[PDB]
Design a protein around this ligand. Structure first.
Ligand code: HEC
Ligand code: HEC
Ligand code: HEC
Ligand code: HEC
Ligand code: HEC
Ligand code: HEC
Ligand code: HEC
Ligand code: HEC
Ligand code: HEC
Ligand code: HEC
Ligand code: HEC
Ligand code: HEC
Ligand SMILES: [Mg+2]
Ligand SMILES: [Mg+2]
Lengths: 407, 407
């Protein structure tokens, strides 16, 4: 459909609303339409018209959102992709230990306003923490550019026009560009100057489409072999478009956790990322040092050698060295997650995995404790991308430690 | 929170400073941070963010520091723990007898530099009396290791890595370690080689985490039944890390009051510790010989038999014999105290308790005398851990005597 580019216009727009018979979108009458000529209540209900299937059982290809009629109450959104499953946003949690703890739902992930569904805009965060981009006009089309303009040529340069598009250009199978026509950026997400014309003001991107390269069957479980998404450069400067203060290359001067291309890894830190495999253990051997749950940039726009990585079978795990950068995604997840500020690990209560009664870990077994924070065991097995509580020590502690071996 | 280990990283660090809304620590702007990525003006204002409650009435669980807005002027810090209540440091005293006596405030206890509060570093003592560790970089994190590395296994060995942590390991309730994962050292205070990387120089610990075992409701009054903290071995060699000359095992050769594991108690001295209960009286009977105000080591790392002691009801008082050692704490108190060089008893003026007008003792009744040295009666009832002037004879003299029966 979007083959790196402007798909099929009618797939998202009706020029009238009569496809023979009667209307094409059941959110209006015969001859009216959505805000633009597209077909939905809002500019972001047109993508949920195909990326939210009706009755799913397990994670499939795309379909990064699972319905709420499906996950009855005490279950977990079923779409294990590297961005996340928006199903999370509508998931509140309560539990008592010595008071009334309550992890809200609208703090896990970006809220898109899809009033056609039960998607509401955020309340607490009226704007974006960094710069000021407004948070009631947060549609899929804000980060993603539906009419894929931004192209990668063969010299590696990026522009918004000049030759035809031929393919996605965002996989391992994706046939590299040639002298006659380019391919499309990592996801169709928009590069420099991509203000959507519906929005009106001064908010206009400034940094380029990042560099990265997905596996090509990116939506999977991770109990067995784990998914590895590659990460070229620029991936932080890009979120920097709508968060600005939070970017930080030089750490000591700017007191905030380093993130960017100007934030190298450290020869020492790097030694540690390998050594620390589990919690209490520091064996090492790069060949095994994973890349899922706390990944890292390679800092190299060479789509040939970096496509080198990005397999979906645990062959190239291949930790890092003091050249590797650390983008915002090494802690967070772009779409959403199960953890209060859309992180990848847990950071709410001292441990993550309790020791059952003997040894071998388990996430815990009582939904009104602090080990689980009101999240039944299946839930929190899906909060991580379906990896059992057996890839962690009986009393696994917090999980920055994959870098900072504070064990 | 610190369950023997690395608690909850975010509890002490912000990676940015925006927890939704606005900032998390009100000591900086939106997207800046403390010296390390933690949240406070200094590396030791992060622990006072939870161990100094706002308005307290009486001593509670932890909270070893009571605010100054609370104790108006003529009152006493309200935290009766076995380390002490830092509230003392900011307490000067004046009185006249035949001149102008003035017991300063910054001599009672270690000064931590918490510029975020009214905590200033020491002036008179620019370094530490023993070796040279500098006394403007004296943070809670200097003696205490926030990322609890040091573990006790089941063989009793101590290391800084190798198995997971499961619990504090520093109480009577604390479930002993097992073959799969260890517990944490007596307090999280750091063992061998624990230089904090902020500090830069040669100052690097050399001796191990001591051995001791607290009661498990350690913060209490003592008017009624008295708190007994147990004391394994090594407790002096440990303060020896930052004071070195002052350690002394063999007395006659090294002329300074004996202190350590190589400093036994004496069959004669030991006979005396029991006999002398009050000042003028020498009844004896070990079963009653206390252990609070002048305690002593047992010299035994056997966490089972030494946990045997350490109750908080006056059952095991159980004086000693010529094997018992004498650590630095048998005279001093680790955090602070009300007595000029942070001791446990008074050693300023001949007596401690005057005889009122009839007999039964009282600390005295006139704040400009020498009996009180400018410390109103309530004050000096809290200088001792709330024990009235009725556990002492009408004219109680100095208080080394619990060992040296110089009465
Ligand atoms: C509305 C604006 C959106 C947005 C923001 C995205 N989609 Fe689609 N999508 C569909 C299919 C079949 C695919 C796979 C086939 C193909 O891409 O040609 C995709 C893929 C994507 C991607 C990744 C593609 C890439 O190469 O980078 C992204 C980032 C994406 N989508 C976002 C199917 C549909 C639809 C079915 C008709 C509709 C409608 C949309 N998508 C709309 C959107
Ligand atoms: C096929 C060639 C077309 C053509 C001719 C157009 N589109 Fe679409 N379009 C989509 C969305 C979500 C928007 C909203 C953008 C926003 O909110 O800012 C639009 C917008 C337009 C416009 C107005 C804005 C502009 O910059 O031009 C126009 C003139 C336009 N489109 C024409 C979504 C989609 C699709 C979803 C996958 C697809 C396919 C297309 N558009 C294709 C076309
Ligand atoms: C690039 C991949 C990123 C990353 C890693 C994050 N963002 Fe966004 N963001 C935007 C708005 C309006 C908000 C407030 C809206 C809301 O709260 O739903 C946010 C918020 C966040 C958070 C906190 C989310 C929360 O629920 O509290 C986080 C952790 C986060 N962001 C990470 C708007 C935008 C953008 C506008 C175009 C862009 C681009 C990004 N964000 C990009 C990213
Ligand atoms: C999870 C919540 C955390 C937390 C609390 C911290 N980290 Fe890291 N970080 C990484 C690198 C390479 C650095 C280098 C800083 C430098 O060496 O100049 C940092 C920086 C820090 C600091 C600075 C402390 C210092 O000694 O300067 C602190 C306090 C800190 N972080 C806390 C890299 C990583 C990771 C790589 C994948 C991960 C994961 C984390 N950090 C996670 C966290
Ligand atoms: C900053 C570095 C510090 C330091 C040096 C200490 N704390 Fe805490 N503390 C908190 C709570 C609830 C407890 C009891 C619960 C538990 O320990 O799990 C403690 C306990 C301690 C101890 C004794 C613990 C032991 O088992 O030995 C010590 C030595 C100690 N603290 C020192 C609460 C907090 C906080 C609340 C968020 C914060 C922040 C800190 N403490 C920070 C520190
Ligand atoms: C959770 C797993 C983490 C991680 C990943 C880190 N910390 Fe902290 N930390 C605290 C304090 C007071 C300091 C200052 C130490 C000093 O002054 O020397 C630090 C320091 C760090 C660093 C830099 C120093 C180092 O040796 O690494 C790093 C990389 C780091 N931390 C990561 C205080 C605390 C806490 C207070 C109770 C808690 C909880 C954590 N840290 C947890 C973590
Ligand atoms: C282990 C439990 C001990 C004991 C029993 C004492 N210390 Fe310390 N000490 C350090 C520094 C820099 C000073 C000077 C700073 C200051 O004066 O505030 C001190 C001072 C003392 C004193 C005199 C205190 C006073 O106010 O005059 C006493 C009685 C004392 N110490 C006892 C530094 C350190 C350490 C650095 C890591 C460590 C460990 C200790 N001291 C340990 C202990
Ligand atoms: C409070 C200020 C004091 C003072 C001034 C003294 N003591 Fe004691 N000390 C203890 C033990 C077991 C010894 C053995 C020395 C030995 O027998 O070899 C000592 C040593 C001394 C001496 C040496 C005098 C001598 O005859 O060799 C002196 C002069 C001295 N101390 C003074 C044990 C204790 C305690 C056990 C809990 C306490 C309390 C004190 N001493 C307190 C003090
Ligand atoms: C001016 C008044 C008209 C009239 C009378 C019609 N057209 Fe359009 N139209 C366009 C496209 C792409 C379609 C079909 C696909 C789709 O909407 O997704 C249509 C459809 C119609 C119909 C079909 C009725 C039905 O099948 O339900 C009819 C009768 C019709 N039109 C008449 C596109 C355009 C267009 C630009 C692309 C313009 C300009 C017009 N239409 C104008 C008219
Ligand atoms: C609104 C409902 C949507 C829809 C349909 C999609 N997005 Fe996004 N998204 C963003 C980024 C940076 C990525 C790539 C990040 C990564 O690969 O880790 C994605 C990813 C996707 C995909 C495929 C990849 C995947 O799901 O892992 C798809 C199909 C997709 N998106 C569609 C960024 C944002 C964003 C803010 C930055 C917002 C809002 C959305 N996406 C919303 C939507
Ligand atoms: C690179 C520029 C970024 C950007 C744009 C964001 N992150 Fe982080 N961040 C981390 C953690 C644990 C939290 C929440 C909990 C806490 O701070 O105690 C956050 C928070 C955010 C927000 C929240 C704003 C708010 O809620 O007030 C936003 C918008 C945000 N981040 C964006 C952790 C990390 C991290 C390592 C753990 C790295 C690396 C980054 N962040 C990088 C970025
Ligand atoms: C700075 C503000 C702090 C904070 C928050 C704490 N400490 Fe210490 N402390 C030291 C030692 C040896 C002990 C144990 C001594 C004993 O048990 O007698 C303690 C004790 C504590 C506790 C609990 C036990 C208690 O309070 O009695 C807590 C919660 C605690 N500390 C926190 C040693 C030092 C030290 C120099 C050696 C310094 C400086 C601090 N502590 C400072 C702080
Ligand atoms: Mg939100
Ligand atoms: Mg002092």
């Amino acid at each position: 459909f979007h083959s790196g580019g402007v798909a099929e216009c009618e797939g998202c727009h009706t020029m009238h609303n009569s496809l023979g018979g009667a209307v094409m979108n059941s959110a209006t009458a015969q001859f009216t339409t959505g805000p633009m000529l597209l077909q939905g209540a809002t500019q972001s209900s047109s993508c949920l018209n195909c990326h939210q299937h009706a009755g799913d059982t397990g994670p499939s290809s795309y379909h990064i959102s699972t319905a709420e009629a499906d996950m009855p109450a005490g279950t977990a959104p079923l779409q294990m992709t590297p961005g996340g499953d928006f199903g999370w946003v509508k998931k509140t949690y309560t539990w008592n230990v010595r008071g009334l703890n309550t992890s809200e739902g609208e703090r896990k992930g970006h809220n898109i306003v899809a009033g056609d569904y039960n998607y509401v805009a955020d309340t607490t965060l009226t704007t974006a923490p960094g710069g000021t981009y407004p948070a009631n006009q947060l549609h899929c089309s804000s980060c993603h550019d539906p009419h894929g303009k931004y192209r990668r040529f063969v010299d590696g340069s990026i522009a918004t026009t000049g030759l035809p598009i031929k393919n996605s250009g965002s996989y391992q199978n994706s046939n590299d560009p040639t002298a006659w026509g380019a391919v499309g950026a990592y996801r169709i997400l928009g590069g420099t100057g991509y203000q959507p014309k519906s929005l009106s003001g001064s908010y206009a991107f400034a940094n380029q489409v990042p560099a990265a390269v997905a596996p090509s069957t990116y939506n999977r479980t991770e109990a067995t072999t784990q998914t590895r998404v590659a990460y070229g450069q620029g991936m932080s400067e890009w979120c920097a478009n709508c968060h600005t203060d939070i970017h930080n290359s030089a750490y000591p001067t700017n007191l905030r956790h380093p993130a960017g291309n100007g934030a190298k890894f450290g020869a020492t830190i790097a030694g540690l990322y390998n050594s620390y495999k589990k919690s209490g253990d520091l064996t090492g051997t790069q060949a095994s040092a994973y890349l899922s749950l706390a990944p890292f940039e390679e800092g190299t726009a060479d789509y040939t050698v970096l496509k080198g990585h990005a397999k979906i079978d645990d062959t190239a795990l291949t930790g890092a060295d003091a050249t590797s950068n650390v983008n915002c995604l090494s802690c967070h997840r772009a779409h959403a997650s199960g953890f209060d500020s859309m992180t990848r690990f847990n950071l709410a209560y001292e441990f993550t995995t309790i020791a059952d009664a003997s040894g071998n870990s388990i996430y815990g077994t009582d939904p009104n404790t602090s080990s689980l924070q009101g999240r039944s065991v299946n839930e929190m097995t899906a909060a991580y991308y379906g990896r059992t509580a057996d890839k962690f020590a009986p009393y696994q502690r917090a999980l920055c430690n994959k870098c900072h071996a504070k064990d």
